[PDB]
Amino acid sequence: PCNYPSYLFCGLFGD
Amino acid sequence: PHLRTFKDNFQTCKVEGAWPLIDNNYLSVQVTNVPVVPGSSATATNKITIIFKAHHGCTDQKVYQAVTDDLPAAFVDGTTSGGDSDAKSLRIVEYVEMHARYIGTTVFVRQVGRYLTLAIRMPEDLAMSYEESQDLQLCVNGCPLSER
Amino acid sequence: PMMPPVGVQASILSHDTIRITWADNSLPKHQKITDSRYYTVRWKTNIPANTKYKNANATTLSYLVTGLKPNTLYEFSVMVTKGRRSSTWSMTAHGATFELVPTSPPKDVTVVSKEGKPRTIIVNWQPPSEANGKITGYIIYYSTDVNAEIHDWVIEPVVGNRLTHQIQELTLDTPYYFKIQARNSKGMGPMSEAVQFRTPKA
């Protein structure tokens, strides 16, 4: 019932 | 470090110190970046803080924190799931992964060498659901021009 | 072999103390030790990664566990030994310690000038490593005077589930000093050491 469609992705990484 | 935004813009940002990646109605993602060597404009991640805000009937507020050489498989209070024992809308599994089913959000955290990497999958309507004052969010708008 | 202990129960006493109690079925009707048997209590939590179990021998059917972390979920199990005879570990029982006051300051205090708004600063930080409970707020103190007494610093209260804050209407080309403290249901934690930030000029 709690459970939430297109997805957006974010990333942060090195170097 | 290198940033890939929700808008698929790839950027190389200095963003030294504590910076918000996400700051919205459902989630706070905060990172600490350190110059790779002193005086370097090249920076990398040594701390990842995730705040899963309280979601009535699904989860109480949970905080995850990983640092270089400390990637636990639990929230700061030693729990591995949000709310009750029966409540599995929010959980952590060992990459260490956070499954916030209640907000259709996944957060992957790993240590690559001396630094931390982060991957976030979030529903578009929830990712763009934030108040006017929440205008500093590296994942939404990328870095300030002066940080690139 | 030997029958493991039963009815392991965790009684929460404080932020660092839990009393463990158990029953031995091998023992007569409540609850007399008449032989050379001894019990072993084991405990751990899941924070930080890869911790090992802590152990303790007990002469009777109870044990007080001290020096625990605040607001932390621990697991507890009991076993019995009698010279050569030894039982397996009992069914595990859990117990979460009470909350406490934060004992360490907010970390990585970073101050930046807002893009296009040089009279606005953005304060960014990381939580205390010793939050000791759910952070319910932070307090940002700022001053143009590095030697001003703490009560003379401008106070900026903030929510506990945020790690960024904006302060408007500041003076340009001026040094400012910032301190932050965390708060939880138990009270105020210590303040971070002042960080200096000089606002930009035109």
Q: What string of H, E and C letters represents the secondary structure of B28-95?
A: EEEEEEEECCCCCCCEEEEEEEEEECCECCCECCEEEEEECCECCCCCCCCCCECCCCCCCCEEEECC
Residue C165 contacts residue C135 (beta carbons within 8 Å): no
Q: Quickly count: other Cβ atoms within 10 Å of residue B37's Cβ.
A: 7
Residue C83 contacts residue C36 (beta carbons within 8 Å): yes
Domain of C17, in residue numbers:
1-101
Task: Among C55, C73, C101, give the residue marking a domain's end.
Answer: C101
Interface test mutation site (partner C, options B31, B60, B77, B134, max chain C beta carbons within 10 A): B77
**Backbone phi, then psi, for B18, in 5-degree steps?**
-85, 130
Residue B22 contacts residue B118 (beta carbons within 8 Å): no
For residue C136, give every residue at least 6 positions away whose Cβ sits within 8 Å of its Cβ, in sequence order, or none. Answer: C160, C183, C184, C185
Strands (E), chain C: 6-12, 18-23, 38-44, 54-58, 62-65, 73-82, 85-86, 93-96, 107-114, 117-126, 137-143, 154-159, 164-167, 175-184, 187-191, 195-198
Residues C117 and C140 in one domain: yes
| Distance, CA of C141 to CA of C147 (rounded, Å) | 13
Residue B19 contacts residue B43 (beta carbons within 8 Å): no
Chain A residues with CB under 8 Å of a chain B CB are: 1-15
Q: Comparing C-alpha atoms, which of C163, C92, C88 is closest to residue C125?
A: C163
Task: Among C56, C75, C101, give the residue marking a domain's end.
Answer: C101
Beta bridge partners of C167: C121
Cis geometry, peptide bond prior to residue C106 (ω within 30 degrees of 0): no
CATH code (residue C11): 2.60.40.10
Of B58, B118, B126, the CB nearest to A12: B118
Residue type, B142: G
Integer-rounded Cα Rg, in Å, for chain B is: 15
Place of tokens 């190389």: B12
| Distance, CA of C175 to CA of C147 (rounded, Å) | 13
Q: Can you spell out the DSSP letters for C36-64?
A: S-EEEEEEE-S-STT---EEEEESSSEEE
Identify the closest residue of chain B to A3 by CA–CA distance. B102
Residues C78 and C132 in one domain: no
Q: Which chain C residues contact residue B49 at CB under 8 A?
A: 126-127, 163
Phi-psi region of B47 (alpha: psi -120 to 50; beta: other; left: phi over 0): beta
For residue C84, give every residue at least 6 positions away whose Cβ sits within 8 Å of its Cβ, in sequence order, or none. Answer: none
Burial class (CB in 10 A: 0-12, 13-18, 19+), C72: buried
Of B1, B4, B6, the CB nearest to A15: B1
* Three-state DSSP state, C158: strand
Q: Which chain A residues contact residue B83 at CB under 8 A?
A: none
Q: Which chain B residues contact residue A13 at CB under 8 A?
A: 1-2, 45, 112, 117-118
For this experimental structure, what is the resolution in angstroms?
6.6
| Distance, CA of B65 to CA of C126 (rounded, Å) | 10
| Distance, CA of B53 to CA of B59 (rounded, Å) | 8
Touching pair C, A by Cβ (3+ pairs < 8 Å): no
Chain C residues with CB under 8 Å of a chain B CB are: 45-49, 69, 71-74, 96, 107-110, 112, 115, 122, 124-127, 131, 134-135, 161-164, 166
The fold for domain B1-148 equals: Protein Transport Mog1p; Chain A (3.40.1000)
Across the interface, whether the CB atoms of A11 and B22 are under 8 A apart is answered no
Residue C60 contacts residue C50 (beta carbons within 8 Å): no
| Distance, CA of B79 to CA of B81 (rounded, Å) | 6
Across the interface, whether the CB atoms of B127 and A14 are under 8 A apart is answered no
Q: How many residues does chain C have?
A: 202
Closest chain A C-alpha to B95 CA, distance in angstroms: 14
Q: How many structural domains compose chain C?
A: 2
Q: Comparing C-alpha atoms, which of C127, C139, C187 is closest to residue C165?
A: C139
Cis geometry, peptide bond prior to residue C126 (ω within 30 degrees of 0): no
Residues C93 and C126 in one domain: no
Residue B62 contacts residue B79 (beta carbons within 8 Å): yes
In chain B, domain spans: 1-148
Q: How was this structure determined?
A: X-ray
Closest chain B C-alpha to C178 CA, distance in angstroms: 14
Place of tokens 């697991």: C75
Q: How many residues does chain A have?
A: 15
Closest chain A C-alpha to B5 CA, distance in angstroms: 5
Of B2, B4, B102, the CB nearest to A4: B102
Residues C124 and C48 in one domain: no
Q: Quickly count: other Cβ atoms within 10 Å of residue C34's Cβ.
A: 7
Across the interface, whether the CB atoms of C164 and B20 are under 8 A apart is answered yes
Across the interface, whether the CB atoms of C127 and B73 are under 8 A apart is answered no
| Distance, CA of B64 to CA of B47 (rounded, Å) | 11
| Distance, CA of B15 to CA of B41 (rounded, Å) | 9
| Distance, CA of C189 to CA of C141 (rounded, Å) | 14
Task: Among C101, C125, C150, give the residue marking a domain's end.
Answer: C101
Residues C134 and C68 in one domain: no
* Three-state DSSP state, C120: strand
Long-range contacts of B103-108 (CB under 8 A, 24+ apart): B103/A4, B103/B26, B103/B27, B103/B55, B104/A3, B104/A4, B104/A5, B104/A7, B105/A4, B105/B26, B105/B27, B107/B29, B107/B50, B107/B64
Beta bridge partners of B98: B92, B107
Closest chain B C-alpha to A9 CA, distance in angstroms: 5
Across the interface, whether the CB atoms of B115 and A7 are under 8 A apart is answered no
Of B3, B31, B101, the CB nearest to A2: B101
| Distance, CA of B60 to CA of B54 (rounded, Å) | 5
* Three-state DSSP state, C90: coil
